[PDB]
Amino acid sequence: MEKTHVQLSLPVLQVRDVLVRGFGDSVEEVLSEARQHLKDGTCGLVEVEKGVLPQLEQPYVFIKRSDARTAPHGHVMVELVAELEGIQYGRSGETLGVLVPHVGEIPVAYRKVLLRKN
Numbered sequence: 001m002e003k004t005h006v007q008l009s010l011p012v013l014q015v016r017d018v019l020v021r022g023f024g025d026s027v028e029e030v031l032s033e034a035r036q037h038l039k040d041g042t043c044g045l046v047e048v049e050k051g052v053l054p055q056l057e058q059p060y061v062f063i064k065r066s067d068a069r070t071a072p073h074g075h076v077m078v079e080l081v082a083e084l085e086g087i088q089y090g091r092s093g094e095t096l097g098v099l100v101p102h103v104g105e106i107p108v109a110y111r112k113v114l115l116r117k118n
């Protein structure tokens, strides 16, 4: 009975502050764990710039833009896509960032998203 989309405010973390640098050891695990942390309010977002991905652990979980036609209520519609060894699992739009566990790090911003609970 979960709705197809949920509005979330994600803490945006700087890469060098992140204590737990990924969600696990396989594509299926990272997607699962990312979803669980998103549900629990314990998921952060790192914006991708040069140097960021090499400082994080693969497989990566990205949130990517799902629709251009509109962004309801200020929350960009996004979906999850994992990457391992240059191969992506999911096909979507532009990356908003890479998801990581949040364990109390102080964010630099909050990113409002409307997440597809695929």
Ligand SMILES: CC(=O)Nc1ccc2c(c1)CCC2
Residues within 6 Å of the ligand: 002, 003, 005, 006, 034, 035, 036, 038, 039, 040, 115, 117, 118
């Ligand atoms: C109320 C709600 O939809 N919570 C929620 C938030 C994020 C996620 C879920 C559930 C399941 C998949 C990821």
